[PDB]
Recover the amino acids of this structure.
């Protein structure tokens, strides 16, 4: 009773339907097979193909039995091979015993082959664009390649194979040197060297440094055509040295450096095994090379980036097209001031990140199992009882699970013709008796709530009045996409929401309707945005959208049309509304948060999540989240939960979530449930430490969020984004930069406590304890399960919201309308400046500058007008005085006195931080710390040999001192920076020698001297001896030894380097 063949199937990249044509788009010399099905299985069935070649009727092709399966027979018809330009049209047919024939088709394909640019025959400079007139290696086209400047450092190439299209205008600030053999195009930032015969482009910086170039054999640039009807693909090919690293490509789970891979720009919903399958929800045809350029292929069609995956020194892109011969290839080679500036330039092209409200940057709580008011009340109560000041709240299991815009258990008179509901239309029952009151109680807790959504109208063949009404309206209005035959497009039956009808987000009227149905959720229920899931749901080549585009072009674009439509809609009603989504392509960054999707509770998954965040970052998707510790699989171990917590608190968006809808016991990845499930009570204080730390750093984090929106600098960055020339930074995927100043190194390996941290050149200070670490090597950091290595860069100015306790990890709550103690942590190093985004006070930028002058025992802070009292925490030795506007401020002897003071200073001996309180003033204030040196290098943080630490004599700095240190083969080794370059310095050695005069031997980069340490009154008396040393650039190895000619026990507190 039937026959079926459909040449492209669902056009899936990864799989085929069993009734497709192979190849889908035949090239010259390729054997063409047609897979055909008939049903039911019967003897005496014939299957054949009726067809024409170049309009000429051919002898029928008889199909061969392939296999039987289920109710069906599958057959193969072999059409043979074809030549470039052949136009084949066929109809597949089946009948039983000479009866009624069932057929599919007709279907046409045009047989293609590659044509490439040969030579540049002439150059036409039009002032805002340059045309290169070209010959082709085959065919009769007259190609034109157009060059323009999006900016003086960003080159755009537009290729028209037929020469019938014209490129776009760019900047005029270029000069041209056109010669017989070569044309050179120059700006203040770029030198574009184009050989004419054969055509070959090299892109150089203006100083001559090569950025990238086309492949050396040339004929690199080409298009796939029958020469008459279709252009089906484009390619270009580039030369790449062995060491070149390639970053970005959207959100990638397998690796941060794609060298060696064929990367598919193809959005896909892959559950749990994204790394293994090399798939992603969020695919962007943009990469950044550590050779200091980006490349962006400007098209929504699928592309494949072959990154030294075929030939060791070649990278290529192959870009699909729908056949339209008027669609130019359009790509950019992007330079800039640095790697982050390359990202900024990319965002000039594809869209800036939209700044989200500060609440988006606190903790988000989520669990699929929350499905009733009492679950929401319990979540709020549990958060409150456990001192968890979260700011975001997600509900997934909230709706009727039919319309997805009506609360579960709500009753109402159904509405026809897609008419919208108001709040008053509903009687609220059962699980949700008062959604408005429920939302109000979330707001009372200082949280903001988002509701889960999909872009599809569900249709599983069940009867459900409202859903049925909406479907009839949607179809009659043409608010769906079209399947290509005049019927609404439905998601393929085997997929998530199979048989459902996608809303055509290209259709403004459709969007207005769809969103109107949700209006009451925003205006009356008072929600704060949507979790817009899915979107990877466009299949089929003939699927047609209101914009005239079809399924090949729209698959990658659809999720971003969907996500952006909802984001803009929610914001139009509630300016503080935030979206939380997983899928998209270039431009996704304009529309809210992206999370890394569906992963298991394992360390392998944690590793893949971090790769996903780092690649997304390079791709301009900065507001990135993950389900901390995984949302499914066996419940995370306490170790994984703690490791994930620490990293999550230092990532752009912090969010816990769980998959299961009605589990027993609870699957919540909340800290209180983690305690319950693992039995490890210490999870709670560890979680609190990290969450409170994040809240302490929220002024810094939110300023970084604004810097993303303004300047294209992502919040969390792979090391080579800041240090592209650093050979050790190239492949690192277990540490990153967070904001401008913090190097974060999470432990993402099971059982690991010795964490390698690569430190780039410069000085890095442990933010938790003041340990100093000279850059330019990989250090080993001991991190137990509760510990996260985080370091501040030299010169850092870090705004913080602190309690009167003034330590990191102390709860300041979630009231985002005020600070407790606004604080700036400062690591003085030369002259540094910072622009603080003061969201509490109308979004004023506060420009702070620090002038480090340790050589003259001074640090100066230029504080602008502020609306709040401010506390500086300056990393330094103890001042002899502090002035504000020249006037001495009072030394506070205790933290209590400091807190009570209007202005003053206090010295934290454990952290080596000077606190300075300045009153709120509507004028600039000049703060000077006098008598200060670079903070001490604590002996207890040194590399120790046969020697231990103690704290049983008062008055030390840091956490203690090295004790006794009085036998041969005992050593204390320091890694010491020069304060102001290679020079002689004075090294202060602070020690106690309670019994008798002591001596120790010191080696400074291998150069030995002996030092005399006179007796102190007793072991509770410290003294300082000044030792002349010569220090060079970089890390200076300073070794204190007890050798054979040394004498007596000492307690060794610290060293200070001064003029
Ligand atoms: O950024 C500075 C350091 O921060 C962390 O340590 C802070 C603590 O440092 C001291 O004591 C620690 C030890 O008790 C031990 O358990 O862990 C680490 C390092 O272990 C080993 O390091 C050296 C070899 O590389 C050896 O010299 C040493 O004998 C080994 O035990 C120690 O740092 C203080 O005494 C504590 O008060 C302080 O809290 C971080 O762990 C460390 O790696 C950083 O360098
Ligand atoms: O009650 C609403 C809804 O709950 C579940 O879906 C919520 C989750 O949706 C996403 O994950 C789904 C995948 O997209 C599917 O392809 C498939 O693998 O199943 C998962 C469910 O885990 C999302 O990424 C998750 O964060 C959400 O928890 C049910 O699956 C739906 O049927 C319900 O309508
Ligand atoms: O739109 C369908 C239906 O929704 C509401 O009632 C919810 C309803 O769901 C199923 O149809 C069950 O059979 C009922 O027991 C539930 O109450 C509207 O009140 C109703 O008018 C409408 O048909
Ligand atoms: O040479 C003096 C002294 O050195 C060592 O003891 C150092 C030790 O002395 C007291 O116990 C203090 O309380 C500690 O803080 C010091 O580290 C030798 O052990 C000792 O024999 C000698 O007299
Ligand atoms: O209507 C198009 C549809 O045809 C085929 O489905 C058949 C199936 O193979 C038979 O066993 C029987 O159940 O009837 C169906 C037609 O209703 C294709 O297999 C299917 O992919 C296609 O959509
Ligand atoms: Mg720029
Ligand atoms: Mg529940
Ligand atoms: Mg606050
Ligand atoms: Mg305050
Ligand atoms: Mg000390």
């Amino acid at each position: 009773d039937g026959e079926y063949h459909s040449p492209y199937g669902d056009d899936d990249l990864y799989t085929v339907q069993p009734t497709e044509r192979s190849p889908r788009d035949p090239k010259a010399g390729e054997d063409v097979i047609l897979n055909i099905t008939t049903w039911p299985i019967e003897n005496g069935q014939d299957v054949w193909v009726e067809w024409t070649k170049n309009g000429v009727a051919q002898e029928n092709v008889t199909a061969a039995y392939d296999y039987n399966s289920g109710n069906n027979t599958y057959w193969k018809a072999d059409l043979g091979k074809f030549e470039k330009g052949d136009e084949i049209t066929y109809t597949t047919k089946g009948s039983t015993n000479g009866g009624t024939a069932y057929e599919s088709g007709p279907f046409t394909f045009y047989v293609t082959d590659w044509e490439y640019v040969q030579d540049v025959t002439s150059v036409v400079d039009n002032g805002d664009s340059i045309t290169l007139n070209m010959t082709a290696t085959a065919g009769d086209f007259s190609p034109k390649l157009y060059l323009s400047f999006e900016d003086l450092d960003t080159l755009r190439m537009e290729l028209s194979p037929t020469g019938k299209e014209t490129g776009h205008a760019g900047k005029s600030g270029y000069t041209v040197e056109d010669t017989a053999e070569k044309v050179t195009v120059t700006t203040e930032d770029l030198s574009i060297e184009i050989q004419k015969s054969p055509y070959r482009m090299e892109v150089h910086q203006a100083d001559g440094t090569l950025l990238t170039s086309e492949y050396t054999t040339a004929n690199s640039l080409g298009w796939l055509t029958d020469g008459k009807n279709v252009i089906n693909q484009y390619q270009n090919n580039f030369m790449t040295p062995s060491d070149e690293a390639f970053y970005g490509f959207g959100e990638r789970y397998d690796t941060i450096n794609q060298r060696g891979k064929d990367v598919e720009t193809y959005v896909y919903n892959e559950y749990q095994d994204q790394a293994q399958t090399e798939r992603t929800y969020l695919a962007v045809p943009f990469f950044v090379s550590a050779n200091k350029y980006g490349m962006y292929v400007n098209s929504d069609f699928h592309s494949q980036f072959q990154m030294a995956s075929k030939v060791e020194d070649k990278y290529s892109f192959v870009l699909d097209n729908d056949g339209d011969m008027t669609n130019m290839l359009d790509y950019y080679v992007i330079s800039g001031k640095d790697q982050n500036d390359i990202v900024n330039n990319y965002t000039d092209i594809t869209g800036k990140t939209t700044l989200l409200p500060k609440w988006a940057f606190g903790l988000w709580m989520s669990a699929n199992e929350w499905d009733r008011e009492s679950d929401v009340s319990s979540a709020l109560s549990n958060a409150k009882a456990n001192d968890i000041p979260a700011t975001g709240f997600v509900l997934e299991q909230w709706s009727d699970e039919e319309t997805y815009y009506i609360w579960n258990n709500a009753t109402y008179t159904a509405k026809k013709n897609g008419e919208a509901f108001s709040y008053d239309d509903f009687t609220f029952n059962g699980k949700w008796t008062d959604p408005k009151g429920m939302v109000d109680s979330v707001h009372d807790a200082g949280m903001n709530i988002v509701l889960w959504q999909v872009p599809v109208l569900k249709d599983d063949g069940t009867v459900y009045e409202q859903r049925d009404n909406d479907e009839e309206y949607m179809i009659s209005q043409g608010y769906s996409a079209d399947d290509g035959t005049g019927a609404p497009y439905r998601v393929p039956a085997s997929q998530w929401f199979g048989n459902g009808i996608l809303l055509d987000f290209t259709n403004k009227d459709a969007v207005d309707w769809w969103t109107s149905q949700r209006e009451y959720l925003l205006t009356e229920v008072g929600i704060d945005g949507f979790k817009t899931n899915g979107g990877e749901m466009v299949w089929g080549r003939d699927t047609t959208f209101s914009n005239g585009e079809k399924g090949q072009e729209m698959r990658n674009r659809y999720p971003t049309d969907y996500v952006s439509s909802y984001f803009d809609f929610a914001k139009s009603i509630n300016p503080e509304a935030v979206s939380f989504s997983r899928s998209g392509t270039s431009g996704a960054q304009k529309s809210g948060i992206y999370w890394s999707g569906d992963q298991t509770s394992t360390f392998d998954s944690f590793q893949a999540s971090l790769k996903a965040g780092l690649s997304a970052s390079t791709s301009g998707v900065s507001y990135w989240a993950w389900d901390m510790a995984g949302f499914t699989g066996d419940y995370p171990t306490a170790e994984l939960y703690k490791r994930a917590t620490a990293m999550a608190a230092f990532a752009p968006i912090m969010q816990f979530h769980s998959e299961k809808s009605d589990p027993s016991p609870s699957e919540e990845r909340s800290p209180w449930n983690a305690v319950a499930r693992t039995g490890d009570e210490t999870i709670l204080p560890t979680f609190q430490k990290y969450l409170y730390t994040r809240m302490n750093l929220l002024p810094y984090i939110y300023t970084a969020a604004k810097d993303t929106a303004d300047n294209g600098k992502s919040m969390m960055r792979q090391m080579a984004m800041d240090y592209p020339e650093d050979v050790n930074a190239r492949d690192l995927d277990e540490q990153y930069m967070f904001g401008d100043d913090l190097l974060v190194a999470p432990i993402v390996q099971e059982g690991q406590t010795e964490k390698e941290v690569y430190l780039p050149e410069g000085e890095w200070v442990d933010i938790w304890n003041g340990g100093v670490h000279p850059g330019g090597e990989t250090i080993s950091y001991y991190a137990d399960v509760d510990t996260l290595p985080v370091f501040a860069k030299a010169g850092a100015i870090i705004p913080m919201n602190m309690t009167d306790g003034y330590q990191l990890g102390q709860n300041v709550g979630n009231d985002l309308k005020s600070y407790d103690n606004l604080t700036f942590r400062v690591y003085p190093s030369g002259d540094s400046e910072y622009s603080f985004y003061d969201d509490v006070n109308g979004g004023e930028m506060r420009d702070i500058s620090v002038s480090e002058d340790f050589a003259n025992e001074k640090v100066s802070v230029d504080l602008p007008a502020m609306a709040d009292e401010t506390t500086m925490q300056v990393f330094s030795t103890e001042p002899t005085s502090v002035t504000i506007d020249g006037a001495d401020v009072a030394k506070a002897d205790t933290l209590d006195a400091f807190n009570e003071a209007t202005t003053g200073y206090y010295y934290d001996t454990v952290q080596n931080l000077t606190y300075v309180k300045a009153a709120a003033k509507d004028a600039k204030q000049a703060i000077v710390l006098n008598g200060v040196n670079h903070a001490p290098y604590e002996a207890e943080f040194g590399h120790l040999t046969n020697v231990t630490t103690a704290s049983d004599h008062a008055g030390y700095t840091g956490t203690g001192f090295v004790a006794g240190f009085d036998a041969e083969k005992e050593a204390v080794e320091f890694d010491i920076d020069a304060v102001d370059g290679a020079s002689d310095y004075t090294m202060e050695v602070r020690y106690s020698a309670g019994v008798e005069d002591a001596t120790r031997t010191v080696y400074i980069n291998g150069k030995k001297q002996q030092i005399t340490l006179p007796k102190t009154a007793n072991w509770d008396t410290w003294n300082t001896v000044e030792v002349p040393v010569t220090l060079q650039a970089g890390n200076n190895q300073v070794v204190f030894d007890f050798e054979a000619d040394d004498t007596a026990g000492i307690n060794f507190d610290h060293v200070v380097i001064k003029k």
Observations:
- The radius of gyration is 33 Å.
- The domain at 934-1059 is CATH 2.60.120.260 (Jelly Rolls).
